[PDB]
């Protein structure tokens, strides 16, 4: 898969599993469009976002909510959400692998680009 | 001041000088609207962002920008920014102060709260 | 594998390749006893740590070799290295994976602990 | 002063108060010898660490107890201990800002180094 993500919790050292990711598209008259939607599971990744043929360049939004993972165990977090906002296959084709690391008053986000 | 915000650099071991980073308020209709602007001191710094007057209740959005920083350096980064969106001083009256830590790959934001 | 261990570089957007890990046990007289050695590869883990039968409970220590990673890319780090002090397997087996995120300035260390 | 170290948590969102901060200096003989040690005062920091004229040249550690921070909270954290160890006043002489962020399973150290 061309687009990966990963999120971890920092505070219970396991990997947050059912947290929302929407993934958008800045549309030609600079609106993000809806491209992709997904619930992480156990592995702490959504499963298939998209596709090497539909994931064209252009820049996408990564956002991952965050709020909703911690009010639900019982924590008030600080953020509203987490976003990665990336130009993406603007040199050409590569494979985007985006990790969180969530906790209540932080978060880092890294990418790691490969080359199919 | 009630909001204060320091960007530093994880490549070069230093605050980032002139960052532009814009903090903005959603407006009544979801509309994000310009709340303070200002640019990184040698401290890693914008000065005055905001007043304990004006900082009223709210969600915020903090945008550093992140990409103009690391081109000028002659490095082409993953991210076109950085933001951090909460609700402040809800629960009454407190003082943020936001870090960011940058590199051209991956950034970290933290949240320290103090009493109203 | 219980022990899993994974360094990314946060200024190149890639596995770390070719990181020195060196595994020690906080052996019986308060001494450390080299337990295991690797050197990452391109997925930025060193192979085959450990097997589950010589994994057994104890006080281990991870060190990454940082500074020999970003002195040959001609960087100057600050850390001499990083490490990572944990009980092992003291309430049960468990699979470890300890992911460390560099900076020639910064360091992020996250254990992601599993129930086998 | 010449170290200033700044512990912060990142569950709760504000500095780190009595967190023990040990310094340790290589001694001749490959030794750690005990150089100052402090407890993290309300601002998340240990005052008075040492002196410009005692903070010479040299391979510096400081120890951050993390174990017992998290225990006194009824948390049982991942790590036995946070250090940082590097190469102090090579160069010349510099002002090294130290900082830690914990979180049970996690923790990043930062340093912000300042011209001789």
Redesign the interface.
């Given at each position: 898969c061309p687009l990966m993500v990963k999120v971890?919790?920092?505070?219970?050292?396991?990997?947050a599993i059912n947290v929302a990711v929407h993934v958008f598209r800045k549309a030609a008259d600079d609106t993000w469009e809806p491209f992709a939607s997904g619930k992480t599971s156990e592995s702490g990744e959504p499963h298939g976002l998209t596709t090497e043929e539909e994931f064209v360049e252009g820049?996408y939004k990564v956002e991952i909510d965050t709020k909703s993972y911690w009010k639900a165990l019982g924590i008030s977090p600080?953020?509203?959400?987490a976003?990665?906002?990336?130009?993406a296959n603007d040199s050409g084709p590569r494979r985007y692998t985006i990790?969180a690391?969530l906790?209540?008053?932080?978060?880092?986000?890294?990418?790691?680009?490969?080359n199919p």
């Amino acid at each position: 898969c061309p687009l990966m993500v990963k999120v971890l919790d920092a505070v219970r050292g396991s990997p947050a599993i059912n947290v929302a990711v929407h993934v958008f598209r800045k549309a030609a008259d600079d609106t993000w469009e809806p491209f992709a939607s997904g619930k992480t599971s156990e592995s702490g990744e959504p499963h298939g976002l998209t596709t090497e043929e539909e994931f064209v360049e252009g820049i996408y939004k990564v956002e991952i909510d965050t709020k909703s993972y911690w009010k639900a165990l019982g924590i008030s977090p600080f953020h509203e959400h987490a976003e990665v906002v990336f130009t993406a296959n603007d040199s050409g084709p590569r494979r985007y692998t985006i990790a969180a690391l969530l906790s209540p008053y932080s978060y880092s986000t890294t990418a790691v680009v490969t080359n199919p």
